[PDB]
Design a protein around this ligand. Structure first.
Ligand SMILES: [Mg+2]
Ligand SMILES: [Mg+2]
Lengths: 38, 54, 61, 47, 152, 54, 152, 47, 54, 61, 54, 38
């Protein structure tokens, strides 16, 4: 019980962090696509 | 029959901890490089307008 | 009765197999994240040299 | 030559390319939005 | 704008009976396929497993509207040992363009679902015999179809 | 009996969560790879230009 | 004992750039959530305004310790017309109890802060572009949350 | 009565109450410490 | 220009100090009120006891 | 330039509003302190009569 | 535009003086009543032990 | 300048006094809570 609850909470935390990171790297893709050829 | 299952849950928990700190590291690096790329775009536009004027 | 025990063993087996799939998934996630970090290192150095290059070109002008 | 002002047609090479270089961009932004929607990410424009 | 619209629908699962129920509630802010006209929206519900289409269901049509209200309930017979292996695919289509480019947008829930879709699925499985209603941003059909060609 | 039904539900809920996290890591690696090709092209641009000004 | 522990951290503000920087330095004498084990402490930093959570940040985990050392720096973009309207909330949590009762203790600085917390905030604003480090006694989360439901 | 020594059960009334009268006390001391910490007050025990 | 930046800082510093003082007065009034309820109960105790001894 | 004057007027307005908030806060503090003093008067008299009562009860014993 | 501000500061200063002497008064009263409550607890414990012995 | 400095000093003094008073009244709350029912 506690093992499953704890693991779920840990997963949820890393999913939050990674969601933020994916937004940031999508900004990165936008900016780098601008600089790719202009 | 159910001990193996909680052992797997234990391993998964540890790896999740490592994935947490990996995600933090790559977040910080993406931030720094993001504003570095901002600087690069500022300098590129500077060369672009300074060429465009003459 | 007879069906309840069978379905019970079924759900148990699927649960264990579920934890095994979790193990595979977090392993492949870890490999992906490591590769991502290495790539961010390489590209970071590349970005340093791009910045230096453009600052040199605008210093020459 | 008396007509040495040759027509530097690079303008139609940097435009027929920057056209494609824009089309491929639009498609890519679709992909980018595809990611944002899939995980439920509001772009920086919101809030 | 460039947005497709949102669909609100409810999910319900009864593990003992193995009954899964999708009530299509409403949709809002649907994108117009063509300019100058308005759509005749309807909704398809595909229950899917291992990338193969099990049962398909359809709502009625609502003419001349971008904000349809449906409240139409569809049920699929899915045993509890299999409920965690399926995917429900919800598509909003323009009946006026049937036979050509149909889809406005679509979404899916269940196995390998992500974001609001996954939290809705899990909400359903965590609240047995209780319908949970949620909104969902429609996603372009090519992206979702790519996502659906992968998982089982 | 109910312990096993509810637990199967939250177990596969954990698996679905982990599969979404996995997808996030995979898409991160894909995007960063593409941007790596981009940065290759960019840097050859500005070094085939910094060798053009020097 | 009944005490929660102390956290040392530094504060820095640059009015022109509108940059606020919190370096989490260390913590000491943390209370054990459970007997017989030791904690995996980490720190959350919530920047907050009008009772709403703006940005949230987290340190890494340090396993098996009640006296962690961090030295991890976090920055928030806060303009000078708004710097006097915010609150920084610092929470120490046990990662081993994530998903249940997490918090060991917490503290906050800024608007409607009191005591050492207020004198630290004011020290920061009185010494622009200079990081001031200070210790802080952790307070129970229910008291601090009550204090935080009031001010804006 | 022959058993007029009735069991005066007030002991379980002044104990089931003094129990609560202690619990409510603990909580209150938390509040009190909440005040002391908030303004930075060392209780008389220190120094 | 700097006079106004620094002065805004020390002005709102005065406001924060005054808000802490205000909180002290409010908590004083709250506590004294509660202790007033307490003293009510205490005095009814010992007057319902001094009328019990007299 | 154009932004500097705007931000300057902004900080000025917030400063004046800050003094007004100070005025409100010290008014409410003064009311709280007065109420506190009145309550300490009432409770002080109550305490006098508690002391007298207990001394009477222990004098009767 | 800034005269009103120093007028407000003046008023605040006066009220602060009054709050100073209020705080002194209530401090002295709290002291006196504190040792009065000490006496009351001594007498209450006296009645408690003198009842407890018989 | 001097008005702000003076007012700050006055506030700080009253905050010291009131801090002492709050400690004293917390002692008062302790003692009165003892006598409330025993
Ligand atoms: Mg670097
Ligand atoms: Mg008196």
């Amino acid at each position: 019980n506690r093992r499953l609850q704890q693991t779920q909470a840990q997963v949820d935390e890393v999913v939050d962090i990674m969601r933020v990171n994916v937004d940031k790297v999508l900004e990165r893709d936008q900016k780098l696509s601008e600089l790719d050829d202009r | 029959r159910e001990n193996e299952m909680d052992e797997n849950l234990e391993q998964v928990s540890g790896i999740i901890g490592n994935l947490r700190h990996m995600a933090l590291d790559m977040g910080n690096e993406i931030d720094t490089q993001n504003r570095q790329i901002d600087r690069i775009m500022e300098k590129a536009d500077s060369n672009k307008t300074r060429i465009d004027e003459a | 009765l007879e069906e309840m025990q069978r379905r019970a063993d079924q759900l148990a087996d699927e649960s264990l197999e579920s934890t095994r799939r979790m193990l595979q998934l977090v392993e492949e996630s870890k490999d992906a994240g490591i590769r991502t970090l290495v790539m961010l290192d390489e590209q970071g150095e590349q970005l340093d040299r791009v910045e230096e290059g453009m600052n040199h070109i605008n210093q020459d002008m | 030559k008396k007509e040495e002002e040759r027509q530097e047609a690079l303008r139609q090479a940097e435009e027929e390319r920057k056209a494609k270089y824009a089309k491929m961009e639009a498609e890519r932004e679709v992909m980018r939005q595809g990611i944002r929607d899939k995980y439920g990410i509001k772009k920086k424009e919101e809030r | 704008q460039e947005k497709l619209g949102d669909i609100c629908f409810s999910l319900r699962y009864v593990p003992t009976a193995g009954k899964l129920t999708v009530v299509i509630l409403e949709a809002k802010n649907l994108k117009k396929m063509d300019v100058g006209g308005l759509s005749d929206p309807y909704v398809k519900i595909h229950l899917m497993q291992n990338g193969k289409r099990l049962k398909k269901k359809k709502t009625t049509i609502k003419k001349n509207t971008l904000n349809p209200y449906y409240n139409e309930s569809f049920s699929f017979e899915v045993p509890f040992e299999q409920i965690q292996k399926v995917q429900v695919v919800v598509t909003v289509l323009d009946y006026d363009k049937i036979g050509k480019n149909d889809a406005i947008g679509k979404v899916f829930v269940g196995y390998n679902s992500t974001g609001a879709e996954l939290r809705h699925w899990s909400d359903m499985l965590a609240n047995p015999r209780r319908p949970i209603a949620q909104w969902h941003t429609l996603q372009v059909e090519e992206e979702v179809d790519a996502m659906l060609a992968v998982k089982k | 009996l109910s312990e096993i039904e509810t637990r199967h539900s939250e177990i596969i809920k954990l698996e679905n969560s982990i599969r979404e996290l996995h997808d996030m890591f995979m898409d991160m690696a894909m995007l960063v790879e593409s941007q790596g090709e981009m940065i290759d092209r960019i840097e050859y641009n500005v070094e085939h230009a910094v060798d053009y000004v020097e």
